Design a protein around this ligand. Structure first.
Ligand SMILES: CCCCCCCC/C=C\CCCCCCCC(=O)O[C@@H](COC(=O)CCCCCCCCCCCCCCC)COP(=O)([O-])OCC[N+](C)(C)C
Ligand SMILES: CCCCCCCC/C=C\CCCCCCCC(=O)O[C@@H](COC(=O)CCCCCCCCCCCCCCC)COP(=O)([O-])OCC[N+](C)(C)C
Ligand SMILES: CCCCCCC/C=C/CCCCCCCCC(=O)OC[C@H](CO)OC(=O)CCCCCCCC/C=C/CCCCCCC
Ligand SMILES: CCCCCCC/C=C/CCCCCCCCC(=O)OC[C@H](CO)OC(=O)CCCCCCCC/C=C/CCCCCCC
Ligand SMILES: CC(C)CCC[C@@H](C)[C@H]1CC[C@H]2[C@@H]3CC=C4C[C@@H](OC(=O)CCC(=O)O)CC[C@]4(C)[C@H]3CC[C@]12C
Ligand SMILES: CC(C)CCC[C@@H](C)[C@H]1CC[C@H]2[C@@H]3CC=C4C[C@@H](OC(=O)CCC(=O)O)CC[C@]4(C)[C@H]3CC[C@]12C
Ligand SMILES: [Ca+2]
Ligand SMILES: [Ca+2]
Ligand SMILES: [Ca+2]
Ligand SMILES: [Zn+2]
Lengths: 224, 367, 29, 37, 86, 148, 36
């Protein structure tokens, strides 16, 4: 999997696989606390019954750990709970605790599955492509230095400058592009009000200008 | 009626004047400023906005020019901030030519220097300022990304504060932290919101891509340190991240791409982008095509081959790896030497060697 | 006559209305 | 777009400069008419 | 009614978002330091009011009353002091 | 399933089913590398114990393949690991490796399930209808020539 | 001020002309192109 990122078909898969492994580590810690709860509780219940059980499931801490862990994959039998003696009270407590453990385990798994789906649904619009290419580019850069030539098995044998002019070109190009992209934003209700007020001020100037002509012609008649 | 009054009874001469100023009735305001003697230009409407703040808000340049000529006009300091906020460049030029700004050093002095004197200059009512007290005109222009307004203020000499380190023990930082510790933390973000805007990064520093890369790292670290404002610093970090990508996207020839990637060919800015996790910069097609040519240094024909052919050469290298290594020692610099030093071949050589190692592990237990 | 709490509430409410009217001006036309 | 709206705002702006000068032409024309009177 | 309830919920958050100094934040949170309005927001489940950064920074300073240096320590150090206290 | 695309009710289902089969082929390749890792590792551990095990699970490469493959569906017992001898060190290594294999297998399956859901969430706005009708139209065109 | 200058001092006759041209002050630009 170290050399896998270099491939275009399998690169994104290995990157997304690593993302989920990091994501489920937090959820696995929560299940560890639940797992440790029933491991201690059921071991205490069945520690006194060493030779009084169908199997040695919950007798010791190690065996209690083994029985509960393999119950995750359904590889532990229900006879783990059954007792040889007629202590039905203790046996039925073991049935309930083992039953609640499985139900709780499914709840934790269900929460883990749902939470990651929500996380991925909020990680859309071509980020996996960027995520893989960044990881591939880190792989490329590690081989650019001339020191790492032979493989490890066979390596045992011993006034302004041009940059300023270019930056001036790109920054000026950026501002013009940035102002054009500003002009592509949707027109706000405040901007429209700016134009409405523009017209409003224009109306008051023109109507008064027409009024100036009328009064000027009035005094001309008086001179006549 | 209303529980709070923000302005009494607004005599008709003033109420007609405020109506004229707000709706750009230019002939009336010129008539009242000249002829009228019983009216003061500082009357306010129900929101505590005088005539100047109404004309600037509605973008009435001719009304503003008339008002600015009137002496003892109040709220000139805020009227600039209102014009800067809405990006009214012509009004900003009109206000900046007033004697209040031309004679004084208000644009050049720091916000702390402006705050030490009360001076009620940027106050827009009886008590308070429209925006945050620490937001100087240059910071406000940077926040709104008014490129022309930022350029105008930069010509005047206004620069953003560039605040001290978070764990600073100097007297000024000690006093601000002890005084409020919330105004101080908000003041830091306002300065960083202006430093991280594209309108200020491109127009202020000599090397905007390098400055943005460093500022992107600086804001990302602040997010972890100051967790309560984590989103505020995380967003500001992204603004610097996509400015560098935005500049890279504009390159149109190899010489321009070389300057952006190699800095002033050691890909210095590519290493910084990987170090600072600017993923869109490294993953951009302009950057990838540059790395790809370095990747296939001397393997001109191998660049366009299919995966099956490239899997064949991996098998060939794996079989002949003992011979290729022997040939490299005998002839370090030759046709074999140049091909073996190609970055792609050194990756294949390491991949082939590991495959041989997995072969030995399986073959060891073949009995 | 007004206490400090009333003055502060007057400042924040007036600040709210101006902010609210600006955010109204940011709606699509 | 916000750029298109600016095209209309500028349209009005150019219209304002044409009309106000046109009104100014009438005022000066009436002025020289008084001088001839 | 559920929509109308949200309009009141985000008005209080909107007012809280506008505070610019500790004195203003004190008036919004403490009402007229007993955080009366923070208790009401929790009682009425105005979650965006309590979870706002302006409100959180006020609770955080009360949370670390006399532990000035412990505020900025790493989790490992804060796990060490838990062991030391234990 | 060749004549299924011709139906309006079952056409889109058969097209989407083929899409997932192509999609999971890439993920299955990744699990093959993981599967081959534990197959060789556990076979090496248990090759020397032919007559010293409860069952013949990991003794040979073929049986190591059989035991690990059927562990995907929970049809392989945990007694695959248990040894007859008192070599608890080797037995507990087998317990850990077999345990890690199952955990890793669930991780690979979980990643596969999530990745396809994300892919389908980005393939919305009436593309399944277009996808099926294109596949049905290819079926129609094959019968238009008079030769068949 | 700014690190990069994209244009000096833009004498008033030219700065007034650029303002007229940008904002469509048609009478002024006709006056300046002819008389000036
Ligand atoms: C209020 C609190 C204190 C109450 C004290 C009460 C004391 C009363 C106790 C004893 C008094 C005497 C009782 C009679 C003697 C025994 C009778 C008997 O035969 O047993 C019967 C079973 O009994 C049960 O099933 C008990 C079940 C308890 C379930 C507890 C669930 C805990 C959940 C925890 C969740 C953890 C979650 C963690 C986070 C995920 C079996 O009978 P049978 O085989 O059917 O008979 C066939 C004939
Ligand atoms: C730093 C590196 C070198 C370290 C060297 C150290 C050498 C030390 C070695 C031996 C020294 C002597 C030890 C004592 C003798 C044996 C004691 C014993 O009884 O065994 C005990 C078990 O022992 C274990 O459980 C070991 C577990 C190792 C787990 C490795 C995980 C690998 C993960 C791989 C992940 C792959 C993922 C692939 C990608 C998906 C059993 O005891 P018991 O039955 O409980 O006793 C009952 C009484
Ligand atoms: C249902 C309610 C009625 C049955 C429960 C009482 C059982 C009565 C009893 O005494 O007999 C148990 C039985 C042998 O008689 O043996 C068994 O098979 C039973 C084992 C399972 C018992 C029920 C388990 C319920 C799971 C509850 C989970 C709580 C939520 C999970 C926590 C989530 C936290 C993350
Ligand atoms: C939990 C940590 C504490 C327990 C681990 C140490 C076990 C101690 C031991 O020695 O005893 C094993 C036991 C018999 O004693 O037998 C068993 O049942 C144990 C079998 C499972 C052991 C734990 C498996 C953890 C799975 C880890 C997976 C890593 C992530 C997966 C990789 C993803 C990559 C795609
Ligand atoms: C089939 C059995 C006998 C061996 C299977 C081993 C594979 C798991 C290993 C051996 C060689 C490896 C390959 C060596 C060469 C490459 C090319 C490498 O880059 C390319 O895809 C070519 C394009 C480019 O380099 O940019 C990506 C990894 C890949 C497919 C490796 C993927 C994993 C491979 C196939
Ligand atoms: C019930 C047992 C005894 C036999 C089940 C066999 C079915 C799986 C096969 C046999 C005939 C097949 C059908 C033959 C005819 C058609 C019509 C064909 O086109 C139509 O649906 C009619 C509309 C159109 O052709 O455009 C689509 C496939 C379908 C349903 C086939 C679906 C698969 C069918 C039902
Ligand atoms: Ca807009
Ligand atoms: Ca106007
Ligand atoms: Ca609207
Ligand atoms: Zn300092």
């Amino acid at each position: 999997a170290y050399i896998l990122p270099a491939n275009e078909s399998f690169g994104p898969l290995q990157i997304s696989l690593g993302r989920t492994v990091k994501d489920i580590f937090k959820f696995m810690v929560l299940f560890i606390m639940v797992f440790f709860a029933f491991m201690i509780g059921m071991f205490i219940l069945y520690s006194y019954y060493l030779g009084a059980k169908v199997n040695a499931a919950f007798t010791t801490v190690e065996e209690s750990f083994k029985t509960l862990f393999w119950s995750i994959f359904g590889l532990s039998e229900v006879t783990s709970v059954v007792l040889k003696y007629d202590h039905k009270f203790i046996e039925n407590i073991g049935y309930v605790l083992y039953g609640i453990y499985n139900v709780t385990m499914v709840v934790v798994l269900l929460n883990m599955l749902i939470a990651m789906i929500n996380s991925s649904y909020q990680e859309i619009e071509d980020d996996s492509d960027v995520e893989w290419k960044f990881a591939r580019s880190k792989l490329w850069l590690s081989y650019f230095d001339d020191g790492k030539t032979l493989p490890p098995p066979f390596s045992l044998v011993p006034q302004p400058t041009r940059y300023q002019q270019i930056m001036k070109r790109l920054i000026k190009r950026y501002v013009l592009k940035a102002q054009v992209d500003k002009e592509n934003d949707e027109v706000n209700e405040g901007e429209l009000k700016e134009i409405k007020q523009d017209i409003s001020s224009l109306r008051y100037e023109l109507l008064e200008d027409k009024s100036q002509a009328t009064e000027e012609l009035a005094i001309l008649i008086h001179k006549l | 009626g209303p529980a709070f009054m923000f302005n009494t009874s607004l005599t008709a001469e003033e109420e007609r004047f405020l109506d004229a100023a707000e709706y750009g009735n230019i002939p009336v305001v010129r008539k009242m400023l000249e002829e009228s003697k019983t009216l003061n230009v500082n009357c306010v409407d129900y929101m505590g906005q005088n005539a100047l703040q109404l004309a600037v808000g509605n973008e009435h340049l001719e009304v503003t020019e008339l008002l600015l000529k009137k002496e003892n006009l109040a709220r000139i300091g805020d009227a600039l901030l209102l014009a800067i906020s809405k990006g009214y460049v012509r009004i900003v030029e009109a206000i900046l030519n007033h004697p209040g700004f031309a004679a004084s050093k208000r644009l050049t002095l720091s916000p702390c220097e402006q705050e030490l004197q009360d001076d009620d200059f940027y106050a827009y009512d009886e008590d308070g300022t429209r925006f945050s007290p620490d937001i100087t005109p240059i910071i406000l222009a940077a926040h709104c990304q008014k490129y022309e307004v930022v350029h105008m203020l930069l010509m005047k000499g206004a620069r953003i504060e560039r605040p001290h380190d978070y764990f600073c023990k100097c007297g000024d930082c000690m006093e601000k932290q002890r005084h409020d510790s919330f105004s101080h933390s908000r003041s830091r973000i306002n300065a960083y919101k202006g430093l991280a805007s594209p309108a200020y990064l491109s127009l202020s520093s000599e090397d905007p891509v390098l400055t943005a890369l460093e500022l992107s790292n600086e804001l990302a670290k602040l997010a972890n340190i100051e967790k309560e404002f984590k989103n505020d610093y995380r967003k500001l970090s992204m603004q610097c991240k996509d400015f560098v990508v935005g500049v890279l996207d504009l390159c149109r020839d190899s010489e321009e791409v070389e300057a952006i990637l190699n800095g002033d060919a050691s890909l210095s800015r590519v290493k910084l982008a990987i170090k600072y996790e600017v993923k869109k910069f490294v993953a951009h097609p302009n950057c990838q095509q540059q790395l790809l040519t370095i990747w296939y240094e001397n393997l001109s024909g191998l660049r366009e081959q299919t995966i099956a052919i490239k899997c064949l050469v991996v098998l060939v290298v794996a079989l002949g790896l003992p011979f290729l290594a022997i040939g490299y020692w005998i002839a370090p610099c030759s046709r074999l030497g140049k091909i073996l030093r190609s970055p792609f071949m050194k990756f294949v050589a390491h991949a082939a060697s590991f495959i041989i190692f997995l072969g030995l592990l399986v073959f060891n237990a073949s009995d």
